[PDB]
Write a protein that binds this ligand. Structure first.
Ligand SMILES: *[C@@H]1O[C@H](CO)[C@@H](O[C@@H]2O[C@H](CO)[C@@H](O[C@@H]3O[C@H](CO[C@H]4O[C@H](CO)[C@@H](O)[C@H](O)[C@@H]4O)[C@@H](O)[C@H](O)[C@@H]3O)[C@H](O)[C@H]2NC(C)=O)[C@H](O[C@H]2O[C@H](C)[C@H](O)[C@H](O)[C@H]2O)[C@H]1NC(C)=O
Ligand code: FAD
Ligand code: FAD
Ligand code: FAD
Ligand SMILES: *[C@@H]1O[C@H](CO)[C@@H](O[C@@H]2O[C@H](CO)[C@@H](O)[C@H](O)[C@H]2NC(C)=O)[C@H](O)[C@H]1NC(C)=O
Ligand SMILES: *[C@@H]1O[C@H](CO)[C@@H](O[C@@H]2O[C@H](CO)[C@@H](O)[C@H](O)[C@H]2NC(C)=O)[C@H](O)[C@H]1NC(C)=O
Ligand code: MD2
Ligand code: MD2
Ligand code: MD2
Lengths: 459, 462, 462
């Protein structure tokens, strides 16, 4: 059968590979941008390539092997380092200057960790139907016996590092049942490894694609005509007998099936019109799940003014405004001597920031840094890079997050095909939504579902 | 039967009134503070009494009469005014000065309203168990077809005005099925009346209490020994045979039953120790419902610099920071010539603000005001009042809000009695949680359950 | 809670009775016609009351007691007769006259019955999801090894008697899995008893109604104002908090819940407007199930011309046109001096006949009877009664039938409530759709689900 795959991110390339392995080689991959890789994507900043999207292989060293790890660490050997979060208690900055006492902070972290552990015990006892689920915040209130969760600046920043920095939305919106504990770490292991290689974390996608798509023997560039870049799909028409896909440039293509891999945000946006309209059950499951936004703001300075050394890689700023420029990282190992800092924001701060100029964002950040390092002469940053994933029509966010209210059955409806229209992508990953390995395994699983239906008539 | 009622806010006074009516007059009302009324409470601000807590009679002029309305508007004649929100579109300020064009704003308001109406239709069809509920935000996404709800400055303050200003928590955390549409408005009417009387909205509670408690002939002060102020209940021991209640000053009282009317926030804080410990099912029901916080910040100025006139009562500040000093009210009718303004904040901003000085909050507000009225000479406020309800141990918030995740049966577990211990209060109102009328009706309903057990020997709950 | 019950047929009355027993007595039953009983309804014909709708208590003498049986045979002692179909082989008339040879017909019946028995065995092994279901006709081809089901006149009329005369649609549309074997007979017994009493089979419903509705001490008539006749519901508005129902006479009623007992056929028609519209899942379940039509044409003649005697009660006409005036009943036992015959038609023929005049129908029937009894001087019938259930807007058919294509899950979606809107009626009976006992039991079942939701706050999800 002929199958059109919409999108050449990790899931689309992964699904097309699996299909090709089943012998379905009459594929046509239509990608909106001028390149493959989607959310795994590097860029030049301050004369070095940094990741705008995914940056870590998460879940390493555990009971099962994360399928992405071997490719990154053995097949391609991309340069990488295990992140160590053990010294955060020594690096929490006060809103007005200097760090807090490490012992006080270590005890707040312990209290937070302990509450989360009680939440893991509780989650284990909830019903599979989801009828007793609750937000992580409700679990925090119950376990601490209070009418509110973390509320002082230090407790809030600790809370934000533990939850929002992973999920990109606050604990009060997040499903406890479906995030605590999290399968990625329970299955693959607790460590995470930061990829810092000039070829980019995206190399993994190019490696996979080259195992079945044709590449130039000199270039190494993909030249297979089954891959067409700059093809923005805007309409998908389907019937019991086949499908037609129209692109923004006016091309029109036909196939027996279409495998949609565009992000959940794209599907919530209407960029692609389905005709007929997707059924209500599908539409509701789509709008109930969340597409989160995690913004990596890179900054480059004329000189270093922050600490370097053991345990100095990650540091937090405890603002009285929750989530305001709170989580920082410095790259003494990754980008020795570059004078770059990375501050991450999400959700509401991400949408506000994407809406204002880089200069204005730079100015707000300089004010925070100056409060943090009152003893230093802090130079203004020389360059800033603000990724605008939520504003980009081909992504509309960075990764899905599971909200309280959606149960496993409704989440599974996200994966479900509609006639001949199949779906894949990180938001269809059975237990790894939000991750690169989740996009990868989702392409394989979605392809298998289509192969069984198409080749064995077992749908 | 002797019954102890913990708390003399509206639901406790109302529950005690109903018991007394059923002839259960061997009552003891234990109130933590030095006064009755609870969350209906006024205070002197710069020379005028303003309400720290409830301020409106909400739900008036509809198909059924809100029971609070006749007392306010006819029995006591408390001075009051209908709030008119029809002119908001002419009163939305830009982050950086001046108002937006009216027609531009009106269209955003009309789109917001249309999404909500579409949400009311969805809501009516959801399974009664609450199992298919979703947040108000999810419904907005569905209806606007976007991966986010309102996100530009003007659409966000319109959203805040429509939802946070009523519920005190954002749409994304709030239950669609239980708040859209809202029974208070569907049943009692769409209008709301702001009480602005020197005697305070709490006069309604003093009135009900007086229908059954003895009062001093000249002062009208309640003197009945069945009401005991300054008595904070710290422990409730209950058994098959009865209950014992201990206060902080060590008093100990016994009764056949106890009716607890302390807020959900108090129950979530463990101020009262139950012995034996409440059942796990009850404990979980308590923690899963939300106790919201709504902070009315009052400001007094040496002279006026904002507009007055038709449609000027309410105005919004479209900050690029959602919920930042967004909803303003000026008092040309309520407190004429006092030069007072009221900005309301909720939730995360309330918690932040209660934790810092009033001077710091006043200076943040002066920057906002000077940005809104750049052509005026905006003098610094000479007085400010920041109510700290979340910090007050006898309240721990302002009113409950039904979150996504709590279902119908879980809400019933929140109300359910445990042995001889009954619960009452706005958080136990089936359809009016969060309101003065919900506390009033919840008092009568809880009392009736107790009366059935006590007088009809029908002791099984649901 | 206040509950409005739409319709006073067996299920509405049965539901209201069960609610009343749970103590829910604030009920309002709105019935479209001027009487209760619905599809159980008698009429005077030829000076005798005959049944226009149900006439048998089906499923008797089995392992479990059909709940209607005791009311009929013991509490009311309605006059009744066991129907005996054992002599059919002696009473099959050829298209042009005279009966076929008994031995020949018995052989054809024996074959039809053995193909059905093989269908029951196949049915038992089909997957519960309904994925392997097939029509009864497909099972017949498989078992007979032929490219068609019964196709000669005698085989066709035996087939119509065995299936259409029960289900009111042909084997090719009927689900094998859900009708062969049929629960009513497997649970309650293989016998059937024809009710022939002047008080009517509807007395069963009048008896249940009188157990909780007030009746005049003299007239015995129901006089409870909770029952209101001539109220045609045309709109049902519902929200998360209650419902409003408006009747064609323009009255408007309000309640907490509504229990809809009108027929599937009425729900498929547009008689009652739901606001908001019912959800797509619900509307699809409604239109996928079938509402069949079974038309009992009674004829009165001036003298008898057909045989009377052992085995003569039921006879068949083997027309070469399937289903054409094929199953007849003579009433020597029931109405001995009447001279009345009953011919039953269903489905396509019922729809055709309801649309033409009684005179044209009578003329068609006289041509058939004159061909069946060529040796007799057949008199013209002097009266005929054609019931028009499909044309009646308050019924739109006679009883639901389960078609191939619908599985249990989808059938259950017919019974499922939508918010505060509940449904009851024979088409919601878990295992006895199409019968009086099914209507009766569905009323109790539906009521209990509403009682758990409303009283116990436990709204069952599946
Ligand atoms: C619907 O109702 C009718 C009416 O009520 C049923 O018929 C009545 O059923 C009684 C149930 O058995 C029946 O019973 C009794 O009769 C026996 C025997 O009578 C004589 O024989 C005795 C022993 O040889 C002798 O000792 C005695 O003196 C008599 O000569 C007696 O032992 C029982 O104690 C009892 O009184 C009635 O006679 C009968 N009346 C009529 C008018 O039919 C009917 O029942 C059906 O089922 C029973 C099992 C029996 O087969 C009936 O004949 C049959 O009609 C019932 N139908 C259903 C389907 O429920
Ligand atoms: C800022 C950020 C940080 C993250 N951090 C990490 C991390 O450190 N580790 C980790 O494991 N995960 C992380 N993630 C998550 C991870 O990157 C994603 O889960 C994964 O890459 C998503 O792959 P996908 O194929 O599902 O979707 P995508 O990569 O979005 O691929 C979909 C493709 O479809 C294309 N497309 C969209 N619309 C159309 C259209 N109309 N027509 C044609 N093509 C279209 C897009 O251009 C894209 O190429 C991060 C992601 C981001 C963005
Ligand atoms: C800022 C704010 C704004 C609001 N706006 C409005 C509005 O405009 N309109 C509206 O309808 N509603 C509004 N509400 C809600 C309304 O005020 C409440 O729903 C209602 O007043 C609550 O009455 P209650 O009896 O349930 O609780 P409470 O009024 O809290 O009464 C409980 C009583 O128990 C006492 N107590 C607590 N712990 C103990 C103890 N351990 N022992 C003894 N006594 C104890 C407390 O002091 C209090 O008197 C608002 C409330 C607030 C605070
Ligand atoms: C011709 C025929 C033969 C049958 N043969 C038998 C048999 O022998 N044995 C057997 O067991 N079963 C048989 N049945 C089926 C059995 O009669 C029905 O299953 C049963 O009586 C249906 O009861 P109900 O309460 O579900 O519906 P109904 O009896 O239809 O009750 C619904 C009530 O709703 C009223 N209504 C409709 N629309 C409105 C409105 N808009 N507003 C208000 N009220 C409204 C109707 O008037 C009616 O009274 C037969 C039925 C018919 C019609
Ligand atoms: C990631 O890959 C490196 C490289 O292959 C691993 O470091 C090698 O590991 C083997 C295993 O016994 C040694 O014999 C080599 O000497 C190692 N090379 C170096 C430079 O130490 C490393 O352990 C890998 N990490 C994970 C988590 O797999
Ligand atoms: C609030 O109370 C005032 C006080 O009685 C009401 O205004 C009276 O209303 C009756 C009713 O139609 C009149 O006959 C009186 O003349 C009115 N008095 C005045 C001063 O106008 C008023 O309608 C009430 N408002 C509401 C919403 O009930
Ligand atoms: C390590 C580290 C720092 C955080 N970056 C992890 C973001 C991965 C997003 N996936 C989460 C799932 C969801 C929602
Ligand atoms: C009118 C007006 C302006 C807003 N003040 C009313 C807050 C009443 C709180 N109860 C809502 C329910 C919940 C949660
Ligand atoms: C006995 C006899 C004669 C046939 N009359 C009974 C009709 C009962 C209708 N219900 C069957 C279910 C279906 C569909």
């Amino acid at each position: 059968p002929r199958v059109i795959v919409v999108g050449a991110g990790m899931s689309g390339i992964s699904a097309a590979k699996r299909l090709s392995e089943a012998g379905i080689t009459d594929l046509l991959i239509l990608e909106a941008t001028d390149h493959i890789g989607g959310r795994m994507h590097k860029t030049n900043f301050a004369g070095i390539n940094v990741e705008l999207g995914a940056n870590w292989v998460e879940g390493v060293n555990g009971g099962k092997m994360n399928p992405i790890w071997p490719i990154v660490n053995s097949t391609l050997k991309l340069r990488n380092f295990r992140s160590d979060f053990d010294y955060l208690a020594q690096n929490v900055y006060k809103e007005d200057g200097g760090v807090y006492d490490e012992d006080y902070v270590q005890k707040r972290i312990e209290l937070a960790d302990s509450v989360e552990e009680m939440g893991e015990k509780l989650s284990a006892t909830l019903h599979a139907s989801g009828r007793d689920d609750m937000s992580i915040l409700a679990m925090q209130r119950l376990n601490e016996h209070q009418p509110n969760g973390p509320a002082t600046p230090v407790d809030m920043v600790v809370d934000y590092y533990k939850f929002d920095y992973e999920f990109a939305e606050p604990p009060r919106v997040t499903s406890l049942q479906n995030t605590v504990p999290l399968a990625t770490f329970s299955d693959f292991g607790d460590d995470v490894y930061f990829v810092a290689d000039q070829r980019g974390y995206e190399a993994v996608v190019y490696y996979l694609a080259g195992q079945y798509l044709k590449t130039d023997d000199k270039s190494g560039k993909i030249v297979d005509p089954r891959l067409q870049l700059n093809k923005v799909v805007r309409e998908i028409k389907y019937s019991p007998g086949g499908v037609t896909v129209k692109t923004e440039d006016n091309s029109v293509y036909s196939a027996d099936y279409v495998m949609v891999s565009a992000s959940l945000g794209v599907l919530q946006s209407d960029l692609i019109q389905f005709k007929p309209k997707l059924p209500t059950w599908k539409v509701r499951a789509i709008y109930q799940f969340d597409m989160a936004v995690y913004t990596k703001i890179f900054l480059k300075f004329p000189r270093k003014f922050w600490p370097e050394g053991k345990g100095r890689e990650f540091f937090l700023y405890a603002s009285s405004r929750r989530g305001y420029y709170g989580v920082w990282q410095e790259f003494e190992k990754q980008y020795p001597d570059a004078n770059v800092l990375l501050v991450t924001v999400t959700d509401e701060e991400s949408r506000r920031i994407e809406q204002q100029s880089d200069e204005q964002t730079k100015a707000e950040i300089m004010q925070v840094l100056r409060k943090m390092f009152p003893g230093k002469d802090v130079p203004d940053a020389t360059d800033i890079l603000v990724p605008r994933w939520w504003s980009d029509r081909f992504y509309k966010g960075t990764f899905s997050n599971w909200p309280v209210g959606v149960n496993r059955y409704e989440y599974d409806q996200l994966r479900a095909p509609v006639g001949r229209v199949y779906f894949t992508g990180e938001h269809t990953s059975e237990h790894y939504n939000g991750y690169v390995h989740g996009a990868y395994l989702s392409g394989i699983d979605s392809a298998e579902i289509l192969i069984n239906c198409a080749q064995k008539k077992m749908c």
